[PDB]
Amino acid sequence: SAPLHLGKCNIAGWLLGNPECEASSWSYIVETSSSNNGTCYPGDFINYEELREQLSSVSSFEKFEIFPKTSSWPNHETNKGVTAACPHAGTNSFYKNLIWLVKKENSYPKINISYTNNRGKEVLVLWAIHHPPTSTDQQSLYQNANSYVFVGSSRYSRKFEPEIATRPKVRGQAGRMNYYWTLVEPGDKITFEATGNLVVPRYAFALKR
């Protein structure tokens, strides 16, 4: 039946790449009562239950590097987005399938990048939107005070206006990042535009039910 057992992780931690969570087909995902690794940065996983339904069984699943880390972001910083909320063997780390992009040399140029699905299968893309707790953090991370993020395909369209809001400390963090996903149909294009606050895809998933 090719059960998929995720060990001590849940679907969110596995797909985002929680470093503590470090399969090509399955008829069901084993549900346990003792998994203790999920999302490590506080924030809401939007439409998580719908994603679990979409992934309940898949006949083909392949992770691929949708936006290669070393070539996709030449004017942004790719190696500083780590946090004690997402440890990896005690070190500050982060989700392995996303990159927490930050400013480079006191500048955050506009991002405008697209992926066109040439795979003949649906592509599942995940990203996150960071809401810092203070204007100090907004400036430290992204330079620009008033940013936006747009994500659009033929099926999905949303403009995000990141907020500055001090929230209760969770895993040391008074900010939040909300997690998002969409399925990109074969032949379609997904575009990401941003002037700050975008936790970009690095790895995405080609799949067939």
Side-chain angles (χ1 to χ4, degrees), residues 1-21 23-30 32-158 160 162-168 170-207 209:
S1 59
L4 173 58
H5 196 302
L6 300 177
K8 294 293 181 191
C9 297
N10 65 3
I11 289 165
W14 174 63
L15 290 174
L16 298 169
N18 179 330
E20 182 93 29
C21 302
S24 56
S25 71
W26 58 87
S27 64
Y28 68 103
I29 302 185
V30 179
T32 85
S33 307
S34 54
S35 84
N36 53 358
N37 299 295
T39 47
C40 46
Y41 207 94
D44 294 326
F45 200 121
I46 300 306
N47 296 342
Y48 183 50
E49 189 180 345
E50 188 181 28
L51 181 56
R52 289 187 311 188
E53 292 170 338
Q54 292 288 319
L55 297 179
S56 63
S57 170
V58 313
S59 69
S60 173
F61 197 73
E62 188 188 359
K63 179 167 64 182
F64 71 100
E65 206 176 1
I66 181 168
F67 294 136
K69 168 186 181 195
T70 60
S71 57
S72 300
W73 320 108
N75 299 305
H76 297 78
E77 169 67 62
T78 65
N79 289 311
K80 296 188 176 161
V82 299
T83 175
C86 295
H88 193 187
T91 70
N92 293 2
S93 189
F94 197 66
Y95 301 111
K96 297 290 174 174
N97 296 334
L98 310 177
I99 302 178
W100 189 353
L101 225 45
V102 299
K103 71 187 185 186
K104 177 182 170 180
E105 298 167 347
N106 290 315
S107 178
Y108 191 114
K110 184 179 181 173
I111 287 165
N112 180 12
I113 190 169
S114 67
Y115 166 78
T116 296
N117 181 349
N118 63 343
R119 306 189 76 94
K121 301 181 178 56
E122 289 182 299
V123 167
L124 170 67
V125 184
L126 303 102
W127 69 97
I129 302 295
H130 181 228
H131 303 273
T134 63
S135 51
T136 308
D137 275 4
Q138 175 72 23
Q139 178 181 326
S140 175
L141 292 173
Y142 314 114
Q143 200 68 47
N144 310 142
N146 292 290
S147 69
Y148 77 89
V149 178
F150 171 71
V151 184
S153 72
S154 293
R155 288 182 178 161
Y156 183 91
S157 170
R158 185 145 171 200
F160 303 92
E163 63 168 11
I164 297 311
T166 295
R167 310 295 187 187
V170 177
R171 298 176 60 93
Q173 311 306 305
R176 300 289 186 262
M177 58 176 67
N178 293 327
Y179 311 93
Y180 299 89
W181 64 275
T182 190
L183 291 163
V184 181
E185 208 189 12
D188 195 27
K189 181 175 66 171
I190 185 168
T191 300
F192 289 83
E193 312 169 21
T195 56
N197 306 75
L198 172 61
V199 184
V200 294
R202 178 182 189 175
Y203 291 101
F205 302 92
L207 62 93
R209 282 165 263 281

